């Protein structure tokens, strides 16, 4: 029950927006979250759910 790249940079932005960062980067990660998760879909979450994944 783990997700590499998707979590990898997923948290990167999560930390950025937490410590106050640019939206451009936060959304950038949001994408890697939706994109990477789609690549992931191994056998745990299927299109893993990181945190943002294009959160509104």
List domains and CATH numbers for the chain.
1-56 (1.10.287.10)
CB 6 within 8 A of CB 37: yes
CB 6 within 8 A of CB 53: no
Distance between CA atoms of 4 and 27, rounded to whole angstroms?
18
State the residue for tokens 């029950």. Answer: 1
Structural gaps in the chain: residues followed by a C–N separation over 2.5 Å:
none
Q: What angle do CA 49, 3, 26 make, to 5 degrees?
A: 60
CB 39 within 8 A of CB 22: no
Structural element, H or E, at residue 10: helix 4-18
Deposited experimental method: NMR
Other Cβ atoms less than 10 A from the Cβ of 42: the count is 11
Distance between CA atoms of 40 and 34, rounded to whole angstroms?
10
3-class DSSP state for residue 32?
A: helix
Rg, the chain, Cα only: 11
């Amino acid at each position: 029950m783990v997700y590499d790249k998707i979590a990898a940079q997923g948290e990167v932005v999560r930390k950025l927006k937490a410590e106050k960062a640019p939206k451009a980067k936060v959304t950038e990660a949001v994408e890697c979250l939706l994109s990477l998760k789609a690549e992931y879909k191994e056998k745990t979450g299927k299109e893993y759910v990181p945190g943002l994944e294009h959160h509104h």
